[PDB]
Write a protein that holds these residues in place. Structure first.
Motif, PDB file in Angstrom:
ATOM      1  N   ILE B 519       7.959  -0.272 -13.622  1.00 17.12           N
ATOM      2  CA  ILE B 519       5.942   0.269 -13.209  1.00 17.12           C
ATOM      3  C   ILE B 519       6.441   1.054 -12.360  1.00 17.12           C
ATOM      4  O   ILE B 519       6.409   0.916 -10.887  1.00 17.12           O
ATOM      5  N   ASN B 521       3.908   3.935  -9.926  1.00 14.25           N
ATOM      6  CA  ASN B 521       3.009   3.541  -8.360  1.00 14.25           C
ATOM      7  C   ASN B 521       2.116   4.952  -7.935  1.00 14.25           C
ATOM      8  O   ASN B 521       3.221   5.395  -6.850  1.00 14.25           O
ATOM      9  N   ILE B 570      -0.526  -5.371  -6.628  1.00 16.48           N
ATOM     10  CA  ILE B 570       0.202  -5.404  -7.725  1.00 16.48           C
ATOM     11  C   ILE B 570       0.875  -6.632  -7.592  1.00 16.48           C
ATOM     12  O   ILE B 570       2.006  -6.822  -8.212  1.00 16.48           O
ATOM     13  N   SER B 572      -0.004  -8.703 -10.458  1.00 15.53           N
ATOM     14  CA  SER B 572       0.030  -8.570 -11.812  1.00 15.53           C
ATOM     15  C   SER B 572       2.422  -8.502 -12.151  1.00 15.53           C
ATOM     16  O   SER B 572       2.645  -8.808 -12.541  1.00 15.53           O
ATOM     17  N   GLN B 573       1.691  -6.793 -11.440  1.00 16.67           N
ATOM     18  CA  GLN B 573       3.613  -6.723 -11.285  1.00 16.67           C
ATOM     19  C   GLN B 573       4.541  -7.351 -10.463  1.00 16.67           C
ATOM     20  O   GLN B 573       5.718  -7.594 -11.560  1.00 16.67           O
ATOM     21  N   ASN B 580      11.284  -9.456  -6.062  1.00 14.31           N
ATOM     22  CA  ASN B 580      11.300  -8.397  -6.379  1.00 14.31           C
ATOM     23  C   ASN B 580      11.839  -7.112  -5.150  1.00 14.31           C
ATOM     24  O   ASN B 580      12.398  -7.673  -4.214  1.00 14.31           O
TER      25      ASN B 580
END
Ligand SMILES: *[C@@H]1O[C@H](CO[C@@H]2O[C@@H](C)[C@@H](O)[C@@H](O)[C@@H]2O)[C@@H](O[C@@H]2O[C@H](CO)[C@@H](O)[C@H](O)[C@H]2NC(C)=O)[C@H](O)[C@H]1NC(C)=O
Ligand SMILES: *[C@@H]1O[C@H](CO[C@@H]2O[C@@H](C)[C@@H](O)[C@@H](O)[C@@H]2O)[C@@H](O[C@@H]2O[C@H](CO)[C@@H](O)[C@H](O)[C@H]2NC(C)=O)[C@H](O)[C@H]1NC(C)=O
Ligand SMILES: *[C@@H]1O[C@H](CO)[C@@H](O[C@@H]2O[C@H](CO)[C@@H](O)[C@H](O)[C@H]2NC(C)=O)[C@H](O)[C@H]1NC(C)=O
Ligand SMILES: *[C@@H]1O[C@H](CO)[C@@H](O[C@@H]2O[C@H](CO)[C@@H](O)[C@H](O)[C@H]2NC(C)=O)[C@H](O)[C@H]1NC(C)=O
Ligand SMILES: *[C@@H]1O[C@H](CO)[C@@H](O)[C@H](O)[C@H]1NC(C)=O
Ligand SMILES: *[C@@H]1O[C@H](CO)[C@@H](O)[C@H](O)[C@H]1NC(C)=O
Ligand SMILES: *[C@@H]1O[C@H](CO)[C@@H](O)[C@H](O)[C@H]1NC(C)=O
Ligand SMILES: *[C@@H]1O[C@H](CO)[C@@H](O)[C@H](O)[C@H]1NC(C)=O
Lengths: 612, 612
Positions: B519, B521, B570, B572-573, B580
């Motif tokens: 995703i 940003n 972030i 949710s991401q 991560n």
């Protein structure tokens, strides 16, 4: 931008157009003629009277130094005609008189907003807001009139009427000439016409008629005049203010109609009308003008000369010891410092003090509004009588910080009996802060028969000037040490305060140091009480154009100037081999003082100095 | 006298007469409408175009706040007619438009030298001497003429012709309209007539004809105009100066005769044309006017509003810790201080920084002439990564010291892991000195579901914007600690410098924080490069009327304003339970930068914040 445009900064070069040609100013590494730039405006009656009063023009032509140049600009829209008018006035005044001064006067018809130089910035940023500086205006308002009528006013002489106008509105009543007392005005300002009788008589009659103030309107086609007394008139004191203005048909018509009329007094701030460049190219403020006379400029010019002559003296060979460098002074402590003097000061038979009493800011507006005495005490050995003894005395100026003096105090060298000493500069505790810079200059005289001081004995101190002033002093008997060739009396005396006879500060008081009860030794303040006694000391160091009564002749001192010590030789009077007696006493009019109200004060420091 | 008449001091009450009646200003303990006093003079073409240009009047009528009042005085001798002329112009501009603003505009026919108030002192002492402030004058001289001819000139738009005139005299040659190239002028200023063709075309043809400058004279009965480009004209760059003046028959006749004519350019210093009183009665400077448009006033007014809204925020309950109190900043060290923070800052979930970057003196003239970045670093434990990390960023204004900003940096609270910390405010080493005042305000939010930061991990830093900019950044893999409810990205990014594409400071550069390689940003400086991108941030804190290009839209920042951090959620991401990956990369036009000359710079400070 434009570099430094504050007092003390160098003046950038510039060029101007004048009826005689191109006037060019260029800084030089040498010392030349001082310059005075004056801005004239028709909106101030002060400058109008300055340029129309014959006394001011005569003062300019007489007292102006021969090493000074004057440039005139006009901030009004009629500069072209204004410059010609000023030149015509000057030439007419100089008729049947000297004409060389005319070569040093230049008139610029150029508009102030078209110079293209740094002068307008200085004129705008050097705002005066003080004595006779700042447009004094009178506003007449009536309900009938859709708008007010504004005119110029010139306050009476500062030394005649101390009363000041109030911002609150007043009334206005017609009293004709005003030299004949009337029934009453009921706190209404009088509207009188100049001429017919005396001005002092007019003010006196108006005050006797219960009037809060007086306003003299000049007849049509006439000019404003400076209100002042003449001899017998000055003894009398009047407690109401007064001013002189022009004639307005509207107020006369309204008064004839009987309609109410109100009058208000205001002071609109203006642009600086005078600024000077010293002989070395340094910008300098010209102070305040108490009354409209060009003399105030001349005095300033004189100071510049002295300053140059001073700066040349300091450049001469000498051993310099800095005691204070802009050290702050206020309160009881004042300014205390400790210094380490040279190892041997014996060869130096001459000692001088260079002092500068400035203000927190460069501008004179940030200075104290009063004159306060300043004394320098020195202590080098607490186990010796010389500690806390006075070494020098000075007097501050009324809101001026350009003071720079040099005083000879060589006979007091023996007070410095230690290589390390402490110096305390003290003023009145309630005085506004000052910034003192002091340097001691040791030097060897050119005299072949050099003499060196070795002993200093205090004799008497001062005190309150009362009937008991002379009763506290007794004869001092002293024996002279061997190997002595000369004896000197060194006395610093200053009178202060006022009493029934205005004594102390404005007194012709005599001081006698009777020696061996056989010979007198007199010090007299003859110049005390004179209107311009202290105005002749500007070439000697006096700071002119002060915001106060710096012209009055004081007793033994002057504003903005060091107190020159009184030194006398008595080697002949004394018996070099034997004992001697000395006795001080002060007198007024040849008799002991008898002050019934508000007794004065006498500050004295006396010493007997013995030379090898 | 007159109290304090400098910026920051309260404004004394006063009264003035106007065509509508008596305008009275009286200080109040509360907050009211701001006031703007403007002095107008016919001797400056800048103000003449301000009051005659339709664009300026439209800007005044549109962008002026509804909580501001304007008073107009005339320093010219035609004040009575000048005020009526200004009122007529304003009313004509407002025709078929809003009329409420007229109630907040007052015109005083009273002469400046008759106000009887403190305003003239401020006008004289607040000299501008800067951009489009200071009477620009042109002097035509010929041997035939007994005297010079002085006229007003308006320099071309600052953003179009950066060339400046020289004080040395020039020549003058008639070239008619000037939009047709001629043989040559041989370094002789061109004398062209407005109209017929384009202004840019005239300047281009004159430059192509080997001319050192151009002078446009308006036809008789016309008015001066502001010289500027239009689209395609602006891409081209011209290296000669130009100005617009009125028509003089004398120069035309002399040129027809063939007599030599010389022209000179000067800047006569003038009186302040604008000064403002804030909503709280505090005197404030209005800065500089780049070009003759009333908008520059409106922006200033806007700032006042913000200031009030700011002063209300600081008055709210909060724990205040002062780090700097007018601490001096210059050189590498900048301003270093040590503070002792409260015992427990855990309950305070909100932390803000109140900063004020002033100059050594109250006036704006004593300020730096350039915009330089300022960074605040904090160190609380040398054995921790948080030491020397950036906490806040600001940008100074062009010669303005009224900056006062409040920035929210709450997520960086964990950096303060010790009760005692050290704060270092640093700017460019070669920057002029500043004086910084900083306070940390701790507070508790009103949110019911309060969250407290506990860990801050730096991610990436900035660097030179070259083709290798993205090659130095590698994927960062991190595991999230337990008991975590929210994760945030806090990035402060600013572009600086110029390159072939004018990138860095005037670039639409995108910054991507790719998360888990799945995703995007994105942060984009869309406003960068716009003529007025930074003009819309004045209500938010931007300092207006700066002595520079403060209107241009920059990349991620604006002059005289704090750098608002970019904060993104972030939670949710990210996988709350697992590892991560995060990777930064910057792009221009969707591709990596390729600067061939003068590469730009990117200053970034990125952090990942974890909340309990
Ligand atoms: C030293 O002087 C005192 C004071 O006399 C003053 O000076 C005189 C010339 C004269 O002007 C006096 O009025 C002054 O007061 C002498 O003592 C006084 O002498 C006067 C007469 O001259 C006499 O009337 C006083 O009573 C004396 N005493 C006082 C004023 O206290 C004194 O004699 C002088 N010393 C000498 C001559 O050795
Ligand atoms: C994160 O974004 C990058 C960069 O793409 C940018 O944004 C796009 C929406 C588009 O405007 C691009 O031109 C921008 O550069 C993505 O990686 C790039 O993707 C583009 C196509 O969008 C491709 O042509 C490039 O080669 C890619 N690589 C680069 C520019 O280095 C990336 O995929 C995004 N991450 C996602 C979607 O998870
Ligand atoms: C300075 O201003 C005063 C006051 O206005 C002027 O006085 C006028 O002088 C003329 C010439 O004598 C008289 O006719 C007028 O009646 C005077 N009063 C006025 C005009 O109000 C004076 O002339 C001015 N000086 C200069 C040099 O312009
Ligand atoms: C400001 O000054 C300019 C320049 O002097 C004035 O411009 C004049 O305007 C009148 C009226 O249109 C023309 O007849 C003149 O030819 C113009 N030029 C001059 C007099 O040199 C302008 O009018 C002035 N503005 C005000 C309000 O007085
Ligand atoms: C002035 O007023 C006082 C008030 O006490 C009065 O006694 C006096 O007679 C008045 N003098 C006049 C009207 O001359
Ligand atoms: C002061 O003088 C005395 C004289 O006996 C001497 O002993 C002493 O050392 C001196 N003190 C200083 C500090 O010089
Ligand atoms: C301007 O002067 C230069 C000097 O090198 C010359 O080469 C050029 O032809 C001139 N251009 C003109 C007169 O248009
Ligand atoms: C810095 O953090 C370490 C973590 O182990 C701690 O031991 C140390 O005391 C800290 N230092 C200070 C000055 O707080």
């Amino acid at each position: 931008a434009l570099g430094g445009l504050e007092p003390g900064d160098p003046a950038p070069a510039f060029q101007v157009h004048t009826l005689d040609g191109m006037f060019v100013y260029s800084p030089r590494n040498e010392s030349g003629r001082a310059l005075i730039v004056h801005a004239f405006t028709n909106k101030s009656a002060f400058l109008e009277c300055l340029w129309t009063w014959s006394e001011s023009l005569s003062d300019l032509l007489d007292y102006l130094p021969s090493s000074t140049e004057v440039l005139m600009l006009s901030m009004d829209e009629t500069a072209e005609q204004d410059a010609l008018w000023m030149r015509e006035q000057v030439y007419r005044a100089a008729a049947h008189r000297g004409k060389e001064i005319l070569s040093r006067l230049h008139f610029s018809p150029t508009h102030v907003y078209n110079l293209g130089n740094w002068i307008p910035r200085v004129l705008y940023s050097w705002g005066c807001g003080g004595h006779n500086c700042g447009l004094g205006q009178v506003v007449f308002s009536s309900p009938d009139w859709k708008g007010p009528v504004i005119g110029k006013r010139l306050n009476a002489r500062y030394d005649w009427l101390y009363a000041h106008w109030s911002t609150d509105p007043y009334r206005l009543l017609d009293v004709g000439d005003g030299c004949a007392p009337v029934a009453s005005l009921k706190g209404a300002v009088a509207w009188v016409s100049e001429g017919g009788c005396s001005f002092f008589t007019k003010i006196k009659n108006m005050e006797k008629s219960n009037a809060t103030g007086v306003l003299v309107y000049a007849l049509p086609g006439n000019n404003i005049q400076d209100m002042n007394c003449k001899g017998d008139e000055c003894f009398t004191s009047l407690h109401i203010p007064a001013s002189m203005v022009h004639f307005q048909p509207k107020v006369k018509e309204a008064l004839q109609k009987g309609r109410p009329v109100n009058v208000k007094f205001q002071v609109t701030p203006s642009r600086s009308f005078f600024f000077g460049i010293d002989q070395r190219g340094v910008l300098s403020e010209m102070g305040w003008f108490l009354y409209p006379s060009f003399r105030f400029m001349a005095w300033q010019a004189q100071w510049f000369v002295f300053n140059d002559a001073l700066l040349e003296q300091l450049s001469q060979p000498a051993v310099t010891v800095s005691v204070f460098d802009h050290h702050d002074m206020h309160g009881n402590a004042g300014a205390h410092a400790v210094v380490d003097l040279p190892a041997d000061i014996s060869p130096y038979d001459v000692l001088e003090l260079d002092t500068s009493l400035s203000c927190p800011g460069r501008r004179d507006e940030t200075c104290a509004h009063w004159d306060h005495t300043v004394q320098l005490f020195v202590c080098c050995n607490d186990s010796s009588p010389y500690c806390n003894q006075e070494l020098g005395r000075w007097v501050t100026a009324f809101r001026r910080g350009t003071g720079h003096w040099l005083t000879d105090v060589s006979p007091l060298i023996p007070l410095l009996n230690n290589k390390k000493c402490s110096f305390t500069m003290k003023t009145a505790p309630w005085a506004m802060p000052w910034m003192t810079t002091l340097n001691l200059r040791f030097s060897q005289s050119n005299k072949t028969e050099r003499l060196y001081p070795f002993e200093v004995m205090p004799l008497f101190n001062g005190g309150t000037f009362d009937k008991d002033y002379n009763r506290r002093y007794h004869e001092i008997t002293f024996s002279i040490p061997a190997a002595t060739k000369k004896v000197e009396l060194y006395a610093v005396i200053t009178g202060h305060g006022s009493d029934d006879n205005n004594c102390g500060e404005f007194c012709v008081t005599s001081h006698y140091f009777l020696i061996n009860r056989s010979i007198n030794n007199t010090l007299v303040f003859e110049a005390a009480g004179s209107p311009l006694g202290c105005s002749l000391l500007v070439p000697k160091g006096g700071v002119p154009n002060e915001c106060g009564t710096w012209l009055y002749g004081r007793g033994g001192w002057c504003d903005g100037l060091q107190v020159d010590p009184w030194r006398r030789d008595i080697t002949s009077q004394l018996d070099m081999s034997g004992s001697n007696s000395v006795r001080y006493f002060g007198l007024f009019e040849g008799r002991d003082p008898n002050p019934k109200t508000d007794p004065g004060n006498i500050l004295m420091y006396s010493y007997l100095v013995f030379y090898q």
